[PDB]
């Protein structure tokens, strides 16, 4: 009894030091595409512009699929058709931001709220800094901090998403489960832009802060993480 | 060197001052006592600037250190001897206050019972 049990429960114990090793290993080698793709995607865009330029000839890189949108103005003196979109983008509060999947429907939702937001096609280190530093998840409908990744796996393990790095394909590459990756992900509440805006009111294009800033949103994100 | 507490935490008080009533200063017919001002125009109530502050909730006190005397022992209003033996176990977290209207002879009786069984009394040395 005792020493038929003693063993029986120690097994379970070790059958775990299998398992929580195995997974730990899995994550680590997943993280290893997540280098290799993550590099190969860079070079293979340069690769090709380099290829084009050799002929008398010419890229147009893939249109961006991902554009995290920062709301930049507050919440009073706000039209309706706007305020509804801004709470479909979950940008309720002033000057938080979400990872939005560009898309004829979504792009055209941003036209209509343009004067209040600031979006751009963000870059890896942007996604990283954000998911890492300011990425809490929605678990039982709660802003809960992503400290161990038994919290990600716990919501998203049914999409082959098991760790903080597996989230981060599904957040460039869009992937199949952009939707559900970017909806345990709870809108990222970003501090005031350190060193300050240019002009909250106007299009970037005319010196302001609003709507599209291609690429240049990554200056903006450094200042607000 | 009296009856130390079980635990002496840092007591913090978000505001230490009283909550006087609007214009309790000008008029003598007004007691300092809060009466919440429901004037249409009245400046206090529309929380206006550099006016008297209004007693609101979230500007109230820490659960642990609530209700707690500077030394540590929250009062009991001990009122004869028999009521003192109630604290015999809860001696070290909170103390006896001997009621105003106990007569000098039993004001004594209670005190030396307290000291016998180590319960602080805040007015031990009072009537005499």
């Amino acid at each position: 009894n005792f020493a038929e049990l003693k063993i029986k429960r120690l097994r379970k114990k070790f059958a775990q030091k299998m398992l929580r090793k195995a997974r730990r290993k899995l994550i680590y080698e997943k993280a290893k595409h997540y280098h290799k793709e993550y590099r190969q995607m860079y070079r293979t865009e340069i690769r090709m512009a380099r290829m084009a330029r050799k002929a008398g000839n010419f890229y147009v890189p893939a249109e961006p699929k991902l554009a995290f949108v920062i709301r930049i103005r507050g919440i009073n003196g706000v039209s309706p058709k706007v305020r509804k979109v801004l709470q479909l983008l979950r940008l309720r509060q002033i000057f938080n931001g979400t990872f939005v999947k560009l898309n004829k429907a979504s792009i055209n939702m941003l036209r209509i709220v343009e004067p209040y937001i600031a979006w751009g096609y963000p870059n890896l280190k942007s996604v990283n800094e954000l998911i890492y530093k300011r990425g809490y998840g929605k678990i039982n409908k709660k802003r809960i901090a992503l400290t161990d990744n038994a919290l990600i796996a716990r919501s998203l393990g049914k999409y082959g998403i098991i760790c903080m790095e597996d989230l981060i394909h599904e957040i460039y590459t869009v992937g199949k489960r952009f939707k559900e990756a970017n909806n345990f992900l709870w809108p990222f509440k970003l501090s005031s832009p350190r060193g300050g805006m240019k002009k909250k009111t106007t299009h970037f294009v005319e010196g302001g802060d609003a709507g599209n800033r291609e690429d240049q949103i990554n200056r903006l994100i450094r200042r607000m993480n | 060197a009296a009856l130390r507490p079980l635990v002496k935490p840092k007591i913090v008080k978000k505001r230490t001052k009283k909550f006087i009533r609007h214009q309790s200063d000008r008029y003598v017919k007004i007691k300092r006592n809060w009466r919440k001002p429901r004037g249409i125009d009245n400046r206090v109530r529309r929380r206006f600037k550099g006016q008297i502050l209004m007693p609101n909730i979230g500007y109230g006190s820490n659960k642990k250190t609530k209700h707690m005397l500077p030394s540590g022992f929250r009062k009991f209003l001990v009122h004869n001897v028999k009521e003192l033996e109630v604290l015999l176990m809860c001696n070290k977290s909170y103390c006896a206050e001997i009621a105003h209207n106990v007569s000098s002879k039993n004001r004594k009786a209670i005190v030396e019972r307290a000291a016998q069984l180590a319960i602080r009394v805040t007015n031990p040395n009072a009537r005499l």
Binding site: - | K75, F76, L77, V86, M89, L117
Partner: protein, 125 residues
Amino acid sequence: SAHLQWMVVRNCSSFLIKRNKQTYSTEPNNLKARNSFRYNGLIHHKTVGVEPAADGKGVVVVIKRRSGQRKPATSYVRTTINKNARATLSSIRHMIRKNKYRPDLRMAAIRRASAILRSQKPVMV
């Protein structure tokens, strides 16, 4: 039953006493004057009490019998203990536990007894 009496006696009780944000219970044998289920004397069917001995020295340990209650006179039995602090507690400990008789009070009964003892000795300088 116990659980029922309680609900009558929760509020509305002559040995209950609530001033000044506490509540308390002056009944004979609860240990630590609490308003409670566990630490209440009467409600229940097995009860430990600890209180000072009438002589000035020692501790009496009151144990409810449960042979036949609704029999207040005899329902409910006492014993003196004049020993030397350590054995005094070891007696209460051995009386409650290893007699499986409400091993909840267990410690409270000790803490009481211990507190009783300190109330009876050279009081002060």
